[PDB]
Write a protein that binds this ligand. Sequence first.
Ligand SMILES: [Zn+2]
Lengths: 239, 186, 49, 119, 37, 251, 99, 49, 51
Amino acid sequence: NSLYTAEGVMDKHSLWQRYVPLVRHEALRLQVRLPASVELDDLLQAGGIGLLNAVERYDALQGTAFTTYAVQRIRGAMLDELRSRDWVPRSVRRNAREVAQAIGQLEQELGRNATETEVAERLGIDIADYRQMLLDTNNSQLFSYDEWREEHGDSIELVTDDHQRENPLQQLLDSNLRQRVMEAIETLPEREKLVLTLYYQEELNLKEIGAVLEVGESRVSQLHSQAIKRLRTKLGKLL
Amino acid sequence: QDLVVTEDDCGTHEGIMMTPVIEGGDVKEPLRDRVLGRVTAEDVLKPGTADILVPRNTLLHEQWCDLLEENSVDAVKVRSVVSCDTDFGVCAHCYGRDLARGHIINKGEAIGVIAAQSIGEPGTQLTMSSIQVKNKGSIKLSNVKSVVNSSGKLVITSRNTELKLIDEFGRTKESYKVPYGAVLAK
Amino acid sequence: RSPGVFFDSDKGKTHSSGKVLYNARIIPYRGSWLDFEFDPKDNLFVRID
Amino acid sequence: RQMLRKATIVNAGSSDFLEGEQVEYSRVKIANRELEANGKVGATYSRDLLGITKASLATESFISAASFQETTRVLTEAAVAGKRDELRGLKENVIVGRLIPAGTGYAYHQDRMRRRAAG
Amino acid sequence: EEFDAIKIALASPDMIRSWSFGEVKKPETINYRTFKP
Amino acid sequence: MGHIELASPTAHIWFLKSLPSRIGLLLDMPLRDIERVLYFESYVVIEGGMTNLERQQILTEEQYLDALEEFGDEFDAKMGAEAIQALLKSMDLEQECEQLREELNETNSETKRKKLTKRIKLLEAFVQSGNKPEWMILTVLPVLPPDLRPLVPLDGGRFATSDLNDLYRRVINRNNRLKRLLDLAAPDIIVRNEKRMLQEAVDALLDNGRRGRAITGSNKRPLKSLADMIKGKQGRFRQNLLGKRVDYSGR
Amino acid sequence: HARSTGSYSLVTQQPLGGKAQFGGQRFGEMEVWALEAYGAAYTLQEMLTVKSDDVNGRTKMYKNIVDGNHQMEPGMPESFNVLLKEIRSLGINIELEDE
Amino acid sequence: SAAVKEFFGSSQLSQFMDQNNPLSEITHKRRISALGPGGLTRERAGFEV
Amino acid sequence: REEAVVWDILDEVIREHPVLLNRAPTLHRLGIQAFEPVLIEGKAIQLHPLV
DNA sequence: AGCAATAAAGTTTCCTTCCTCCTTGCCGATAACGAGATCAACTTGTTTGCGGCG
DNA sequence: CGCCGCAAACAAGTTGTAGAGCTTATCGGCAAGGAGGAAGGAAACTTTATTGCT
Ligand SMILES: [Zn+2]
């Protein structure tokens, strides 16, 4: 690209070009981790763009190196894109790195493992703190179609369970009971049949009628109760 | 997948001759079997000549195979499947009988289905000098060019020819082909 | 199979030839394999892994 | 007879000179064209043979071809060409799950076919 | 439900437009905790 | 179905890497040439303002410079999908059809006759289908519904997912980057890398280890594409569509 | 193991397999080819629609049975349209000609 | 520990024991293969072995 | 609760109420047939020998 | 029995409200180490097509 | 023309048999915010129960 100035573009871009190898080699140990670590090309694109941003705003009177002004934005960009891929918060991972340091450090202190009260004391915050963190951090993503072990008898897509299923007779008898509500209340005062119909039938408004009559719904309460007492006059399981 | 019967008869023109598979030794498929449930290509006759029994087509059941096995025919044509001309399908006449049923196939059936199953099922099971007449009978050599050799006997001057033993009646007993200019005793 | 060395010859690979092709193989316990072999026209060739 | 549903062309005047094509369709055109339609503009023919595995794909329908083997290639060479299958095989009906063009449902199938004729 | 035949055709872009309802713009699906979209 | 808008076009693979292309197969050009265009390796002529040079004429970027400083204006030569797009856009069918059918008559030697027929019916197809060849390209995509690539939780809060999602995401990231980059008019090399990575992401969505080598998760196992929803036994046809699990049954 | 009615899939709503998970049995193409050989349309039609996928179908048939009614109505499998949607996702104007 | 625990838990070779009968265990322990890593596969490998 | 009427009613139904039975693999079309029930007190099917 | 009153009790709404936390974005300060590979695959195999390849 | 090489691509069926992880190591401070959050409470509002009058 370019600027309004031209020699401040060609010097700009010559510098840009010259320390692409820096982008490389500093990246070239930020390897084995998450599979874009395998890619490395994302890294290069990112590095170039962060470079331009640093470049745009080099501060020269400070007398720092421009490589040293660069490294800041370089790293920050790299970390940004990794932070983009992960979808879990940050202080999470602070705590995770911290337990890692501490637990290794103190397992060296002791020379053996797994005496969690040591975690409690060393991280003198609370037990429930790390106890919850253990959930929060250490439990990660898995995939759906992986084979079920002793070659390909079935997958994980066979062995699945659900709770929100359909069931045919509950809606059936629900409608039976709806018409039984009608069967009870068609004999009863003009409004209450209607309030309970149009509230329970087509899923409309209740006190919308309390505003229409303007009786305070004392009588509404009473008649609601009596209709209950009348539909404790039938027998139906699904209890 | 595609194949069915479309039509009752296609009224189509002729097809193939069945003639027996006796070669090497004795019969290995009766001509009767190769008639059973065929349809004739044509009106067909008897060695006492001019005795028709199909008006171009019949169900060729064992009455007829017997009626023929009385006599000495050795070749008959059939409205083969291949000469059936029906566009997108076939006629039943060209097919004839459903074996498992035992009568003329009705219209409406699938075929190559049956073919594929019938052929695939067993196949699993299924990997698992001189010429010297034995018996008397007339000799029949066809499409020959040959010569009396200097000794006086016959030697073939066209690779076409092959020896037969025909019985005294006229049906073949045996058939064995003889090399070009091979030495004969007869 | 062991590590070490191994000899063999395929028989009419380009079956137009119907010709033998001898070749040798090397298999370290750890590290890279290696293959020496001939061609239809009696010339040596090599390939790693 | 299922191995043989194609023949290559000798002459021309109806279509391309030697383009591979149904024998049956050749018979149709000449059962239509070489008739009093015309003495001859249409063409004569060699006769072809084809092994089964590539005969099977080499078909009007793409679907049955697309079912089992090299479906993608089929799919392209059809979809480029604005092709369309007409629901006449078995598989064509079982996949959509309609009644078979045969057997018991033969009769309703011919009913639906005269409906295809009758609107 | 009842239909006659199949036909394949090419996917013109405007058909993508007509089939669509809206444009997606970002990688995520959900929150990690609120098991929500 | 949803959709996605792209910055720039890309092209389809089944139209290309498969047996006979139908893309360059049309043009009368090889495979490798068009790869090295769309791998962004070498320029090629669009349309010589000077007929000094030729259409379809490949330009390594270095000898490109010779012509570049020699004329500058009077040629058009690019590298990528837009270029091929405009080629595909430009050419007429009709004339090529007539001329092929004409000069067919001259020397209908075998392989020549074959190739002529080949093209001619390609052409005829493009006509009579009503299609437009332009639509080989891809500048806009569909989205499929979640229920076909879902994400659901487990007993202990854990999850399970469909890999497709992952592949959508990379695409999106790259494209958004490219926009951000384009807003700055940045030096072009970055753009080049950006789009090669783009199209690589694209076809890897479609069919992973066909052109370039396949993407995996941490396990060292592929991120399963679309195609294998449809293929082998595992595909819908032979698993799930023809042979069927059944109720009111037993053993 | 036996099974009348129970759980299903979710992606495609058809039944499962395994006595542990109250499994339905499988019906292969081989069994189709046989049925074709006899030529019984309504049978295989049914087991492909109602006892496998067509949900409206399974529902209303169960309704009719308990009502004493031994009759049928068909629909279309969902898995078909799933295939359609995969196709169009692959960048294609797959579609259908209405009658 | 990750390497140790995995192939004591992740390898094909590491298997439940077959607790049905004495023979089951002793013999299943004397059981030999050419499979897994550094070995072979069903479909590729043929008759010769 | 499995009352005696339950079994009586089953007997009412299943007469003339035929079924389909299947061995695997289906080579030819007789690999399946169409039989008529008879109830028996076990967990295991009896079958006419010849088939 | 039908109808209301007073009093009491529990509310849902619901709305603010100010504590507290939590999350989205940015920019920074010494100087220089190296162009990856990294832990894999074992070569099925016969048939068929097409690009070269003469 | 007739190699030659290369590359693609199918590889029985249906039961069951149990369970899944991770080489990982991935600023760091500030701000400003905007959501949320809880508090304890006010307050429509609603709901109960106990005595009055047709
Ligand atoms: Zn016929």
